[PDB]
Amino acid sequence: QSAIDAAAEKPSVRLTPTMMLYAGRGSHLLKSARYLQQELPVRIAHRIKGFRCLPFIIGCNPTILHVHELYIRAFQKLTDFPPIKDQADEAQYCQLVRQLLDDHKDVVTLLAEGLRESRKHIEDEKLVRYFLDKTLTSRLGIRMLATHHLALHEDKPDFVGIICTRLSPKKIIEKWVDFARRLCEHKYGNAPRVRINGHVAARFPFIPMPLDYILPELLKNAMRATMESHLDTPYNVPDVVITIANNDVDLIIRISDRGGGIAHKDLDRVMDYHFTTAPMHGFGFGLPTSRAYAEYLGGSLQLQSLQGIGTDVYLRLRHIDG
Amino acid sequence: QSAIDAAAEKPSVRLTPTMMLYAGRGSHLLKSARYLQQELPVRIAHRIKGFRCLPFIIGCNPTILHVHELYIRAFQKLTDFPPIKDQADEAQYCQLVRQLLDDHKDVVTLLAEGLRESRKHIEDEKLVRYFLDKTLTSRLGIRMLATHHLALHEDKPDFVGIICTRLSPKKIIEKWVDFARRLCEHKYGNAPRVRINGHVAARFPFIPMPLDYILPELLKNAMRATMESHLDTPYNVPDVVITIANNDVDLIIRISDRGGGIAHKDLDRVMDYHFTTAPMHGFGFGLPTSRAYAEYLGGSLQLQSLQGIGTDVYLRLRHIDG
Ligand SMILES: Nc1ncnc2c1ncn2[C@@H]1O[C@H](COP(=O)(O)OP(=O)(O)O)[C@@H](O)[C@H]1O
Ligand SMILES: Nc1ncnc2c1ncn2[C@@H]1O[C@H](COP(=O)(O)OP(=O)(O)O)[C@@H](O)[C@H]1O
Ligand SMILES: Cc1ccc(-c2nc(-c3ccccc3C(=O)O)cs2)cc1
Ligand SMILES: Cc1ccc(-c2nc(-c3ccccc3C(=O)O)cs2)cc1
Ligand SMILES: [K+]
Ligand SMILES: [K+]
Ligand SMILES: [Mg+2]
Ligand SMILES: [Mg+2]
């Protein structure tokens, strides 16, 4: 479509987490919605550009074509909406944003299926990794903007949209610990206990949304490895130790397990999409998605394998405030 | 000299640690000495080539020139010796090797002084790091060959020259722990206790010589950081935890301290020669020498800083046997 061509070239306008805390007023609701209305089609068109740039044989896969078609229909639905002038115009847009978040819920699952089906034709090894990294980060960016504006309507305590003003890293870790242990216990009959140390009382403004994905994935990985390495003593398994290091530059969460580590042969494949050695696991998405997430947010995800003993996983996320 | 020109081009012949275990027979003494006699001048000439390749203004420094002159006189002394035919010819060579090890004892200290004096003229940032990395590794290579042949005369238990047949990583760590604590206690009035865990009963053939330098340097660093971060409670300081991970590919020694970590601003300078934030410390050689050492021996030295909490230092060394 010619309308998509125009918005693909248009540069992306990023709203810094520090700037995002401008929710005062309800004139602040209109100001935010007017931004969301202009910024959402640009992000969609940038991704349509990525589908258009895929090699022909891959872009032709019926599942890839379907996802491409979903992105085009999404851009159509969003741009057709008239500009926001009053609180009635702001209200109807929120319903399009909520529909966008539901119509595109399974885009990554269809994209992985389509890309996997096209294995025979994929020559560039990096092609799939870069396409999924770019898709996953754009979606996080869109979901961040969309959830933030939708959350501005609610009067959620300790939050300004999706920014928590008083986030405790200990609390968010604790939240996922019991959730991962319940999944682990289901498959292995037991789960390792988790110990949290370091800056346990650190409290700071932060966006928990990315941590809500990364932490359960990293805890599921650490727990599965601990269980698969202690199969002969499933009830006597070593604890997973999480350390919080909060400094003025970044937040570091180190997840140290005694699960035998990542084998030297698998060490270069663990960060590849679909690579697994196994619903908890048997997907191969946990690590590459978590790294793409951490890096998109000015951080990093680093692995330190001690083969025969365990692994230390270092999640770093840059603090809010420049 | 024209004789040096000839041996600079001659490729280096490396004796694999696995091959080195050929001490049988005393015809094995002659076979080894005949190799040492031919290989030692090649290693010296390769380094003379490095001095000849330094930029003129740097090579002209009187201290640099003196070290260059030491390498030339060393090559002269070694090549002038007649080939080894009998046990009297083998015996006299061992005295030249022992003299070589003493005449060149302070080469690195003079080289660092000369290179530091030439700071104003050094344009390439990597120049000093690569020169010292190459000097330190060549010396380790020469010292390995020289000490191995000299040790073949002794009947040291559990050793074949410099290869320990039954090395315990726990024991060698323990050996340096009390030594580093005594140095640390002298400056800070106390020292952190050290805890060793993991493959504590692992025993394997290995060359301890590089570990005899790396371990005390890494323990001195971890202990100094722990003391400087707990200055208000110098008698209540956290333990330094060393983990041994012995697998079929490599030996991993992780030294984890709660010494506040390496600051983000210093993180890229810590591996540079002379960089320090301070006879234990105030040298800036510990980290870059240890990494050059680990890498020369098919391993690595990796740092993981948790700013505000501590640092994890990962020493990896490839096992003996291909
Ligand atoms: N803590 C860990 N210890 C050992 N291996 C791990 C650990 N975390 C991840 N891995 C390895 O990395 C592979 C890929 O991980 P991930 O991307 O999370 O996928 P999945 O959990 O679906 O298998 C896993 O199958 C596993 O072999
Ligand atoms: N465990 C550690 N924790 C914190 N900082 C460290 C640690 N190890 C090294 N460093 C930093 O790296 C610098 C350089 O280390 P090194 O090369 O060992 O030199 P030196 O010990 O002579 O200062 C140190 O001055 C220190 O600031
Ligand atoms: C336009 C749009 C619609 C839905 C989304 C969603 N993203 C998620 C998600 C959450 C965690 C890890 C990955 C993902 C992922 O599918 O991208 C769920 S719905 C993002 C953008
Ligand atoms: C020909 C020759 C002579 C002496 C040597 C020595 N090397 C050391 C040493 C030990 C540990 C860390 C560094 C060094 C270092 O000075 O290279 C001491 S004497 C190496 C080669
Ligand atoms: K993976
Ligand atoms: K240093
Ligand atoms: Mg996973
Ligand atoms: Mg040191």
XYZ file of N, CA and C and ligand atoms in Angstrom, chain A residues 100-101 104 108 136 139 142-143 213 293, ligand 3:
51
model
N -5.748 -4.102 18.822
C -4.408 -4.294 18.238
C -3.628 -5.254 19.097
N -3.680 -5.077 20.423
C -2.994 -5.949 21.365
C -3.552 -7.383 21.356
N -2.853 -9.206 17.380
C -1.446 -9.545 17.175
C -0.845 -10.374 18.326
N 4.307 -13.763 16.983
C 5.606 -14.415 17.133
C 5.526 -15.934 16.949
N 10.476 -9.011 18.076
C 10.240 -9.058 19.508
C 10.450 -7.712 20.209
N 7.654 -5.132 19.145
C 6.439 -5.505 19.849
C 6.499 -5.051 21.280
N 5.925 -1.306 21.174
C 4.494 -1.029 20.922
C 3.675 -1.334 22.175
N 3.899 -2.503 22.790
C 3.213 -2.932 24.001
C 3.504 -1.988 25.165
N 8.801 -10.885 31.966
C 9.066 -11.967 31.018
C 10.416 -12.626 31.357
N 15.396 -8.409 24.709
C 14.691 -7.564 25.655
C 15.682 -6.697 26.426
C 1.089 -4.980 18.637
C 1.422 -5.981 19.711
C 0.480 -6.893 20.148
C 0.762 -7.789 21.161
C 2.015 -7.803 21.771
C 2.343 -8.831 22.774
N 3.552 -9.070 23.219
C 3.553 -10.123 24.142
C 4.832 -10.665 24.626
C 5.061 -10.737 25.999
C 6.240 -11.280 26.480
C 7.199 -11.748 25.608
C 6.991 -11.687 24.240
C 5.800 -11.159 23.741
C 5.494 -11.203 22.291
O 4.663 -11.991 21.838
O 6.099 -10.288 21.579
C 2.328 -10.632 24.400
S 1.122 -9.831 23.476
C 2.970 -6.893 21.330
C 2.673 -5.999 20.315
